[PDB]
Each structure stands twice: as structure tokens, then as C-alpha cells.
Design a protein around this ligand. Structure first.
Ligand code: MG
Ligand code: MG
Lengths: 82, 76, 75, 80
DNA sequence: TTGCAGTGGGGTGATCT
DNA sequence: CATGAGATCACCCCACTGCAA
DNA sequence: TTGCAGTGGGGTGATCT
DNA sequence: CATGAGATCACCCCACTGCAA
């Protein structure tokens, strides 16, 4: 590659670099405000951060409840002379 | 007010902007791989995307399960 | 035993290699010190140059001491 | 370079390597025992080491002497 | 009402891998 | 990161030399 | 009088640069 | 070590948009 060639190649490289990021921001955008909405990059990332924590918290609550529900039906089976 | 004076000023505005995004990718990073690691931006995003989807399905599945378990409780 | 003889001599050859290598390490400690990392030939190149350097420095000093003593005597 | 070529090359590189050391051990030999004498590698280096130390010690001795001679000459006039 | 901050696209150079 | 290659080192094997039993 | 350690040459793979 | 080259990042400059004064 000559200087101009490196440049031109690098620009195509950098184009691929940008999509590697911008394409994932769109993916995150669709996950947090949906495919139809329009939202700016930092806002999408801000929503993605809080959505993840929300989902993480929910997951914990959902699990705590699943165990309780399971412990409940299990106990329902116990007929033992009390 | 010179063009260059104006380019320089906006340059400071653009760094603000760039950091509005970068600071946030670092936040996502700390959530997916933690603080000690080093992971490029696109990989932080890829992980965050997959983590969200993973949690989304994990949560939906627990919800489905919890429904039955709850109804089982009823039908008992 | 061709082999056993080899193994045994191999130990002899290591002792030998070490007889040269440990000296290069000493020469190295002398010319660039202990913390440095320097390859064998540079250690030797330096040693050679260092000796030549001190040789000339000491000659010059001896001829000058000569002249100084002559002066003192011739006074 | 194929393994075969790399091999052949390496042997010539290693020939150059050895010479870069051996050629110097003989430069040292000549300094410690002379052009004509023959002494083995480790004894040449042992001699080089001790010779350097001696050259170092001598230089210090010589400098001190040089100063004393110089301080001598001075007084040899500086007598007020 | 419109001129700047904000926002984003694309290019470059330095540096990394 | 990859390839490419010369450099550096330890160690291999071989040859031989000379001294200590 | 001679085998065995010592010495040195060159090759080679592993690794560094 | 030396290319070589893609990837990564920050910053550049440019264009445009929307809102605060
Ligand atoms: Mg960016
Ligand atoms: Mg050697």
C-alpha cells in the first residue's frame, strides 16, 4: 500500500469500525425504546444501563418468587399428621 | 470568533458530546465485565445487548413458570 | 552406553560451558553492572575496549607522572 | 525460507554468532597473554577479569600519585 | 426567529493487536 | 496480531588432546 | 600408557529481537 | 527487531437540527 492507498483502506476500515459500534447502539435502541422510536446515542446507552439493572432486579425478584411458589406447592403435598 | 477560534470552541463541545457516549459505554462495561477488565466499545455493546436479551428471556421464563406454579398452588 | 557415555559427557560439557559463561557474567558485572542485560559479545567488546581504555589512561598517567617526577628531580 | 532453507541459514547465522564471541575472546587473549601465547577460553576470561581489576586499581593508584607529584611540584615553588 | 450547543457522519493519525 | 528473519543462547554430538592413575 | 575430563567446532531447536 | 495491516480510539472538520434567548 502507498500512502494514499493506506488512507483509502483505513477509511474503509474505520467505516467498518463505526458500524461495529453504531449498529450495536441501534440494537440497544430497539431493545429499550423499540424499533419504531428514535433516540440519540447517549440517551439510548443511558436507558440500556438502567434497563439492564431493572432486568437484573426483576430477575432476582422473579427468582425469589419462583422458589417461594415452588416451596409452597411442595409443602402443599405434605399431609403428615400434624 | 476566528474560524479556528470557532473550530476550537466547538472542538470542546464535541469532546463533551463524545464523552456523553463514552462515559456511558464505560458504565455498560462495568456492568458486563466489571472494572478491572479492558474490553473494546463494540464488545461492551455486544455483551450489553446479549445480556439484556438473556435477562429478558430469563425473566419471561421465570414469569411463565411462576404463572403455572401460582396456578398449581390454586389447583391444590 | 554410547548414549550413557553421551549423557555423562553432556554433564561435563555443561560444566565447561559454565566455565566460560560464568566468566562472561563476571566481566559483564564489571563493565555494565548487575542490573543490566547485555549479550555475550557486547560484554566482551566492552571488556576489550575497557581494557584498552584503561591501558591508555594508565600509560598517559605514568608518562605524566614520569615528567612530574623528572621535573621534581630536575629541581 | 522453508525449514530446510531456514536450517541452512541458521547454521551460517550461528557461524557468525560464534565468531562474534570467539573473535573477541582472542582479542582478550592477546591483551592478557599476548598475540603469540595460546591459552584456553575460560582462562583468558578469568585473566581479563583480574587484569581489568588490576587496571582499575592501578589507575586509581596512578591518579593519586599524579596528584601528589603535582602537589609536590607546586610546593617546590609555592614556598613563601 | 435564528444562531449556537448538540448531534452525528466521515476522515486521519497515533497507537494497538 | 501476523509473517519473516537474523540473533542469541543452551545443548547436542563429534573429535581430539593430555594427564592421572 | 591411556580413558576420561576438558576443550572446542559446528549443528539445531527454542526463543528473543 | 522489521514490515504489513486491520482494529481501535480520539480528535478533526463538516453538516444539520432544534431550541433558548
Ligand atoms: Mg463513537
Ligand atoms: Mg561459547
Amino acid at each position: 500500500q502507498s500512502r494514499g492507498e493506506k488512507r483509502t483502506a483505513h477509511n474503509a476500515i474505520e467505516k467498518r469500525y463505526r458500524s461495529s459500534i453504531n449498529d450495536k447502539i441501534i440494537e440497544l435502541k430497539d431493545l429499550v425504546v423499540g424499533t419504531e422510536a428514535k433516540l440519540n446515542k447517549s440517551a439510548v446507552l443511558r436507558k440500556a444501563i438502567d434497563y439492564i439493572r431493572f432486568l437484573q432486579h426483576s430477575n432476582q425478584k422473579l427468582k425469589q418468587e419462583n422458589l417461594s411458589l415452588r416451596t409452597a406447592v411442595h409443602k402443599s403435598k405434605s399431609l403428615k399428621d400434624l
